[PDB]
Amino acid sequence: VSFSEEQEALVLKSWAILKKDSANIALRFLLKIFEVAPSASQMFSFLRNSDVPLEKNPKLKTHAMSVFVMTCEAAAQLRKAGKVTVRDTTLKRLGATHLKYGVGDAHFEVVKFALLDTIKEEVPADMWSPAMKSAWSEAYDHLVAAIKQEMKPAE
Amino acid sequence: AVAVSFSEEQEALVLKSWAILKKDSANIALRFLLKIFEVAPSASQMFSFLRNSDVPLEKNPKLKTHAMSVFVMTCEAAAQLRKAGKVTVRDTTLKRLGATHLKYGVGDAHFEVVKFALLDTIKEEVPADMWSPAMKSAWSEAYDHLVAAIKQEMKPAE
Numbered sequence: 001v002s003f004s005e006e007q008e009a010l011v012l013k014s015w016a017i018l019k020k021d022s023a024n025i026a027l028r029f030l031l032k033i034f035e036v037a038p039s040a041s042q043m044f045s046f047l048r049n050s051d052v053p054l055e056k057n058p059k060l061k062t063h064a065m066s067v068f069v070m071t072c073e074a075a076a077q078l079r080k081a082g083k084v085t086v087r088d089t090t091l092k093r094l095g096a097t098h099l100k101y102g103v104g105d106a107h108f109e110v111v112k113f114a115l116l117d118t119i120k121e122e123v124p125a126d127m128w129s130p131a132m133k134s135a136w137s138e139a140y141d142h143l144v145a146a147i148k149q150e151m152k153p154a155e
Numbered sequence: 156a157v158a159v160s161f162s163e164e165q166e167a168l169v170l171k172s173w174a175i176l177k178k179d180s181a182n183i184a185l186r187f188l189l190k191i192f193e194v195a196p197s198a199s200q201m202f203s204f205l206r207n208s209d210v211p212l213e214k215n216p217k218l219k220t221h222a223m224s225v226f227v228m229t230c231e232a233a234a235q236l237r238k239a240g241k242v243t244v245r246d247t248t249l250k251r252l253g254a255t256h257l258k259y260g261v262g263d264a265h266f267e268v269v270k271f272a273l274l275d276t277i278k279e280e281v282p283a284d285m286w287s288p289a290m291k292s293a294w295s296e297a298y299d300h301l302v303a304a305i306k307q308e309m310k311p312a313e
């Protein structure tokens with residue numbers, strides 16, 4: 001896996017834009033998943049805030065952030081070491097949770113799709129490219145693959 | 156029972172939009188197929204590899220035939236909900252659909268992704284003057300009900 005500094009930079013600087021506006025963007029991201037695959041949003045709770053009808057669960061925002069943060073971290077690792085180097089304790093845990101809630105390939109792929117959609121939508125038209133798309137995809141795909149190694153018996 | 160409300164208007168919306176797709180069928184099918192692969196590569200990959208050994212998504216007859224089915228059967232479900240008040244897929248045909256999809260690991264997310272792609276195709280291919288939220292909802296209702304029937308034969312009658 002050759003993951004260049006340029007590719008990493010595409011991920012970092014695009015993320016820096018989503019971070020500046022993380023509350024509004026997280027909600028658009030969540031509602032995108034709900035649009036594509038309502039059953040994914042079902043794996044969590046329903047509804048809870050300050051007497052609000054919106055889709056504002058705390059755990060949904062936190063999870064959204066985790067996906068983006070860890071994928072970004074994963075970009076960093078591919079550059080530095082050419083592989084995902086997340087703590088083996090963290091990987092076992094991620095493994096166990098996702099298998100417990102019955103997350104399959106379809107779910108990981110829906111989230112990938114909504115993640116890329118969100119980035120394209122939120123960053124300026126001239127920052128976006130197939131190169132940006134592939135930089136994020138590669139990182140995500142490598143992170144998902146490592147989690148899945150811990151979702152099945154000793155290879 | 157589940158309260159059916161499928162109208163003549165809804166059926167008409169499905170049918171005339173269906174007529175539009177058939178003027179550019181091969182190309183529309185291919186775009187629908189690339190939508191699925193874009194959202195859920197795995198969904199697409201269930202349609203095999205060795206027996207034909209045809210690499211490309213673009214070449215797979217199973218894929219083209221399957222797309223045709225999703226659309227055609229959904230149209231019929233429109234017509235059936237309107238006339239009969241329910242999906243009237245003959246029962247051997249229905250048991251066979253439930254078997255085949257259970258056999259290939261098809262779950263709720265898969266059914267939703269296909270709906271997502273079907274609605275995309277509908278919005279992308281029909282003229283902006285023609286398209287409306289009502290048109291989207293008519294397709295969704297017909298599709299949802301067809302899926303509800305197939306799923307009944309994918310779980311214990313229990």
Ligand code: HEM
Pocket residue numbers: 040041043044045059063066067070071093094097098101103107108109111140143144
């Ligand atoms: C790269 C992708 C993803 C990352 C990095 C990620 C990360 C996480 C993390 C850090 C947690 C906290 C749970 C724990 O570790 O104790 C979590 C929980 C969870 N994740 Fe993911 N996740 C990913 C994809 C998905 C997908 C695709 C789904 C479902 C469509 C999903 C469903 C869940 C569920 C249901 C929980 C449990 C949350 C709860 O207890 O309410 N995750 N995920």
Ligand code: HEM
Pocket residue numbers: 198199201202217221224225228229251252255256259261265266267269298301302
């Ligand atoms: C309203 C929705 C759908 C309809 C009407 C439909 C209809 C069909 C039909 C008629 C067959 C013919 C095989 C047989 O049973 O003899 C079939 C096969 C199959 N379908 Fe579906 N399907 C639907 C949704 C899905 C979804 C969501 C998936 C997966 C993402 C899927 C995956 C398959 C697979 C893998 C086969 C077997 C391949 C083959 O033998 O050709 N289908 N479907």
